């Protein structure tokens, strides 16, 4: 099944701080950063070649206004919220995320949620056409939003507008989004304090999902192994490392197994 996602996230901070923008919005298509706005540049800018090549000035213009609109809204929201919590100052954050997922061309979900100081505040339930108040302080917001038919406005965006544009973005960047790049894998052993720590690093793979496992004598061994998870490179590719603890001089018995879309069969690597 062909899955595609459009995700916008938005951050408003009272304490960015030094030389940093207090308001930042970015967008992702299939997990890949493609647009960016902040309170410093006050303009939307491309983050991938495919959106840079396919979008016209009217697009960037159109987005910049909504961006500047959102900046002003969250500037006020910061103020509105600290007064609601009877706060006078300090470090605070407003976070929004919204977007949609499509499957085989059709939408399967749409979300719209915000957090205050890193915790759930309100979230759109498109099903019951209702905003869920996560904390008592959010009830006034829940009420006024439903009062002004915000559910109808966001149902419209999440089911029509978001979907329509996601389909466009997917077409624009189909070639780059659907590419596969091999990882470069290195296995490295280091012996200290009576323990042979074997590490396996996969460098520069795309897309993001990957499984890296340790095998001892051909058997999957997830006992003394630890994973750093999947972390980004600067160039849109990804990285991951997994370690396992073994006995001194016993390295030959271990293989690193890498499962990735770029590989027809799992890769096997040794020290």
């Amino acid at each position: 099944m062909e899955l595609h996602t459009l995700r916008y996230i938005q951050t408003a901070m009272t304490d960015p701080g030094p030389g940093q923008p207090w308001f930042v919005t970015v967008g992702y298509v299939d997990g890949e950063l493609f647009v960016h706005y902040n309170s410093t540049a006050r303009r939307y800018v491309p983050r991938t070649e495919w959106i840079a090549a396919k979008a016209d000035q009217q697009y960037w213009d159109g987005q910049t206004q909504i961006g500047q609109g959102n900046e002003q809204i969250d500037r006020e929201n910061l103020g509105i919220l600290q007064r609601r919590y009877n706060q006078t100052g300090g470090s605070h954050t407003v976070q929004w995320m919204y977007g949609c997922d499509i499957l085989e061309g059709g939408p399967i979900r749409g979300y719209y949620q915000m957090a205050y100081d890193g915790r759930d505040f309100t979230a759109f339930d498109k099903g019951t056409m209702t905003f869920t108040a996560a904390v008592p302080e959010a009830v006034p917001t829940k009420r006024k939003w439903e009062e002004e038919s915000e559910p109808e406005r966001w149902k419209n965006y999440l089911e029509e507008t978001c979907v329509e544009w996601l389909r466009r973005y997917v077409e624009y960047g189909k070639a780059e989004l659907g590419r596969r790049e091999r990882p470069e894998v290195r296995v490295w052993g280091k012996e200290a304090d009576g323990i042979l720590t074997l590490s396996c690093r996969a460098h520069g793979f795309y897309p993001r999902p990957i499984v890296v496992s340790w095998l001892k004598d051909g058997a999957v061994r997830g006992q003394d192994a630890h994973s750093g998870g999947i972390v980004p490179n600067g160039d849109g590719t990804y990285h991951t490392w997994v370690t396992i603890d073994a006995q001194p001089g016993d390295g030959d018995k271990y293989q690193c197994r890498v499962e990735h879309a770029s590989l027809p069969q799992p890769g096997l690597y040794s020290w």
Partner: peptide, 9 residues
């Protein structure tokens, strides 16, 4: 395409 978020109360 983005959209304007809500105003808090």
């Amino acid at each position: 395409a983005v959209k304007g978020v809500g105003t808090m109360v």
